[PDB]
């Protein structure tokens, strides 16, 4: 149905996340491989798929990337199969070792799948995701900002205080006081 | 109007998709994503305005206090002071806590009528280093000349910061120390409570599935052709 | 150079265009029936002037 370029995987919550920000979809899937041997008849599957994924990688990322082990297939709630085919770009190539092991660590009757005919559900998860994750970037910055703002003015205070402690403190106390210093 | 009118310059059947919902969602993104950035984009502003405003605040603060200041603006306990309009900064020397020794009395004995005005102390640098005998500043400095003197004076009694905490001296004798807990606090910060948005899933979701589209009809027509063509095999 | 102002980073979210996305369109549908009896009736319907 749909071929993807730049399909980000991320994994949280025990939950494999593919957004692609191309179709603009976010497909839900488990953390293991569902296996293309259960699937009643299904060749053009890993065919097409293969054919498919050899197509883009040459097209576009042959000298960027590195191939990170043979494809993978989940399948995605709403009743989507999801071939998959990991990769990691030139820079940071060292950690090709532990990479290459972590995605070949995914592969462990018949069956039709159904797929809905729907796919909304899985863009909206993904416009929300997207923006749910900027505005918590954002508001989060601004509260970091702002505490360490008034740790800033603690210092003006104290030099403030000493010039005029009846307004400081009854600033400080919430009603009109009188103060003095007694040392520190 | 002209600019309007700039727009103007086989056959084909123009085909439509079914499904609105791709521009329904780039409406909705974009409304919110115009608002949030508005929104964002004034806060940036007005923060930066602010951080020049009290420029003007700490420039008089560091003529009131250039050791604190200059210790919250450089990173580490320093000392300053001013040579005309720049500041001038050294590196301070760490004692540990265990180091310091609060003297009893506040009063010296050699001349009556004359109490030290603030508690002397007596430390060592290292831990079988030589003893020096001080007096304590401001914000656990251990200063170096005892000219902090007072005449005594009958009501006497003084809190100073020591360590984590603060030591009690009641005329001019040493009460005891007394840790931070202890004294009503009052505050001068300003509170801000920010919770990140929650993580949402979206279940898939159908009014109509196409076998409910499929049975809308009252008669499938290849379902009755495959049962009517088996009349001479049944 | 020391400084008494305190950082913030404020990036503006970027624009994202939505591109029209269909699982499956009626054409597929209609052809989902294994016998679409409009054609079957016109394809018939010839055998006189064929
Ligand atoms: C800071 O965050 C929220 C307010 O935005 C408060 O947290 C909730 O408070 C309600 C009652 O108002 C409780 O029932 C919830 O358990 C709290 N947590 C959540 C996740 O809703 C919190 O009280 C605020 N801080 C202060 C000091 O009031
Ligand atoms: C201010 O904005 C962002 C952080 O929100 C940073 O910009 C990106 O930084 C990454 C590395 O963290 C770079 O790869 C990107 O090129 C930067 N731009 C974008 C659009 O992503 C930026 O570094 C922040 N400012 C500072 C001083 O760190
Ligand atoms: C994921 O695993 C759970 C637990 O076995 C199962 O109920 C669910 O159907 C799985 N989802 C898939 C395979 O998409």
């Not at chain 1, 191309?22 to 053009?44: K, M, Q």
């Not at chain 1, 910055?141 to 008034?150: G, K, P, S, T």
């Not at chain 2, 409304?31 to 930066?48: K, S």
Request: aromatic letters at 10%.
């Amino acid at each position: 149905w749909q071929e993807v370029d730049e399909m980000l995987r991320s994994e949280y919550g025990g939950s494999f996340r593919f957004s692609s920000d191309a179709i603009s979809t976010t497909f839900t899937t488990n953390l293991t491989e569902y296996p293309l041997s259960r699937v009643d008849l299904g060749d053009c599957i890993g065919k097409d798929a293969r054919d498919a994924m050899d197509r883009i990688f040459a097209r576009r990322y042959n000298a960027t990337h590195i191939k990170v082990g043979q494809p993978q297939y989940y399948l995605a709630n709403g009743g989507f199969l999801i071939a998959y085919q990991p990769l990691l770009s030139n820079t940071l190539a060292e950690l090709y070792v532990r990479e290459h092991l972590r995605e070949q660590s995914r592969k462990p009757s018949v069956e039709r799948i159904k797929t809905t005919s729907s796919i909304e559900f899985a863009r909206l998860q993904f416009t929300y995701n997207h923006i749910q994750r900027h505005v918590n970037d954002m508001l989060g910055r601004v509260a970091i900002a702002w505490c360490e703002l008034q740790n800033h003015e603690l210092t003006l205070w104290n030099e403030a205080r000493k010039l005029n402690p009846n307004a400081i403190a009854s600033v400080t106390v919430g009603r009109r006081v009188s103060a003095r210093m007694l040392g520190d | 109007h002209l600019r309007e009118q700039s727009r103007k310059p086989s056959v084909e059947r123009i085909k439509t998709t079914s499904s609105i919902e791709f521009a329904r969602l780039q409406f909705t993104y974009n409304h919110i994503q115009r608002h949030v950035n508005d929104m964002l984009g004034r806060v940036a502003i007005a923060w930066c305005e602010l951080q020049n405003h009290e420029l003007t605040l700490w420039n008089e603060a560091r003529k009131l206090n250039p050791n604190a200041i200059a210790s919250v603006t450089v990173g580490r306990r320093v000392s300053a002071r001013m040579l005309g309009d720049v500041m001038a900064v050294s590196t301070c020397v760490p004692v540990a806590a265990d180091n310091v020794i609060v003297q009893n009395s506040m009063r010296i004995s050699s001349r009556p009528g004359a109490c030290y005005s603030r508690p002397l102390v007596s430390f060592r640098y290292e831990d079988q280093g030589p003893l020096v005998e001080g007096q304590l500043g401001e914000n656990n400095e251990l200063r170096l000349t005892r000219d902090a003197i007072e005449p005594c004076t009958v009501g006497h009694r003084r809190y100073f910061t020591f360590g984590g905490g603060y030591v009690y001296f009641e005329e001019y004798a040493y009460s005891h120390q007394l840790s931070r807990a202890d004294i009503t606090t009052v505050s001068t910060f300003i509170d801000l409570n920010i919770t990140m948005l929650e993580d949402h899933e979206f279940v898939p979701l159908e009014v109509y599935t196409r076998h409910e589209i499929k049975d809308s009809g009252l008669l499938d027509y290849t379902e009755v052709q495959r049962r009517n063509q088996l009349h001479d095999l049944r």
